[PDB]
């Protein structure tokens, strides 16, 4: 894309016909502090205090961090487990052996006192 093939008779890493960029066209660095990109929640000093406490008291002890991971797994399991079971049990309340036995006992009482 740039030029002809170059063989090993040039002896210099950069051939003389390769153009260089003068310093006047180089992008100068910015040497000041830009404003931080932070959200509303994390800009709260209380949240920063919580993060500092969490770091210094749990993150710096790896087995305590492993306990933290175990707690996260516990929360994951219970979040994915409890509501589905609750709605499943609430959906089939009338399809229960207790209801069937209640109906059977009522019919037996009626037939007995008939």
């Amino acid at each position: 894309v740039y030029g002809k093939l170059i063989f090993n008779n040039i002896k210099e890493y950069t051939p003389s016909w390769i153009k260089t960029i003068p310093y006047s066209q180089v992008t100068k660095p910015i040497l000041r502090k830009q404003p931080q990109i932070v959200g509303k929640i994390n800009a709260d000093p209380k949240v920063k205090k919580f993060w500092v406490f969490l770091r210094e008291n749990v993150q710096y002890y790896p087995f305590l961090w492993q306990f933290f991971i175990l707690g996260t797994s516990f929360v994951w399991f219970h979040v994915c487990y409890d509501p589905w079971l609750a709605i499943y049990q609430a959906n089939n309340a009338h399809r229960s052996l207790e209801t069937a036995l209640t109906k059977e006992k009522a019919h037996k009482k009626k037939l007995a006192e008939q």
């Binding site: 000041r32 830009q34 404003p35 931080q36």
Partner: protein
């Protein structure tokens, strides 16, 4: 940090000469030289002192009146 208005910090309008900026910086420096406000003053004057830096800062702002 947070977004800062250099002209408001130096107490000068946008169409102010360089010597006006120098005088404003000196007046504000006599007072707060011996923290945060002095740092803001220093940053604003450092940006607005260089003509190229001041021009680049002015181009990005696209100021509103008032």
């Amino acid at each position: 940090t947070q977004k800062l208005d250099y002209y408001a910090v130096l107490g000068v309008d946008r169409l102010a000469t360089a010597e006006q900026i120098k005088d404003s910086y000196r007046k504000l420096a006599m007072k707060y030289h011996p923290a945060r406000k002095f740092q803001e003053i220093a940053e604003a004057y450092a940006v607005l002192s260089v003509e190229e830096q001041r021009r680049a800062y002015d181009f990005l702002n696209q100021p509103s009146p008032y």
